[PDB]
Amino acid sequence: MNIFEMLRIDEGLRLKIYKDTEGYYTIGIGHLLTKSPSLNAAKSELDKAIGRNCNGVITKDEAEKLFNQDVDAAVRGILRNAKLKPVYDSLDAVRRCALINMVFQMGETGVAGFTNSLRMLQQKRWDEAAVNAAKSRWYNQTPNRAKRVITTFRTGTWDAYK
């Protein structure tokens, strides 16, 4: 298991524009296109992302390209954020993947708001971190996914994805 496979499991793969859990236009492997309720807008942003007139549909290849860009961007975002970096560098490989997942889902800012859990993770207080993180809108809104990521932080293993 790696970051790609993990996110591919949590986000799925859809070749046509669809709405995510929050109702936002998305495509591919969890690639948010726009928060706007306008489908046209979504179509616009998609073409601009791909570089061609897609008419709301892309190929697998194209979905994977977006995914590579998105993961790269997520990691780079972590390293550039003064609140996230230290945490990330303190972790082992597996747990780092859990942190990337959260950032991919919620954005850096969103993750950066988990102050207390981040501190706990930095202190390697696994269980405490797991219980604090569950007290969130994130956990209540997408609990199965959140449970998988939380378990990952908790154990440092991929058991939740097997």
Q: Is 116 in the site for Cl ion (CB under 5 A)?
A: no
Sheet holding 14-19, edge to edge: 14-19, 25-28, 31-34
Q: Is 135 in the site for Cl ion (CB under 5 A)?
A: yes
Q: Is 151 in the site for Cl ion (CB under 5 A)?
A: no
Give the burial class of 90: count Cβ atoms within 10 A of its Cβ; 0-12 exposed, 13-18 middle, 19 or more buried: middle
User: For 122, left (φ over 0), alpha (ψ -120 to 50), or beta?
Assistant: alpha
Q: Is 44 in the site for Cl ion (CB under 5 A)?
A: no
Output the smallest distance, CB 109 to Cl ion, in A. 19
Applying CB under 5 A, the span of 27-35, 62-70, 91-99, 137-145 interacting with Cl ion comes to 137-145
Q: Is 34 in the site for Cl ion (CB under 5 A)?
A: no
Tell me the site size for Cl ion, rule CB under 5 A.
4
Residue 101 near residue 7, CB atoms below 8 Å: yes
The amino acid present at 67, given as its one-letter code, is F
38 annotated ligand-binding residue? no
Please identify every residue annotated as catalytic: 11, 20
Residue 132: CB atoms within 10 A of its CB come to: 19
117 annotated ligand-binding residue? yes
Of 49 and 130, nearer to Cl ion (C-beta) is 130
Output the smallest distance, CB 147 to Cl ion, in A. 8
Q: CA-to-CA distance for 157 and 108, rounded, in angstroms?
A: 23
Q: Is 142 in the site for Cl ion (CB under 5 A)?
A: yes
What residues make contact with Cl ion under the rule CB under 5 A? 135, 142, 144-145
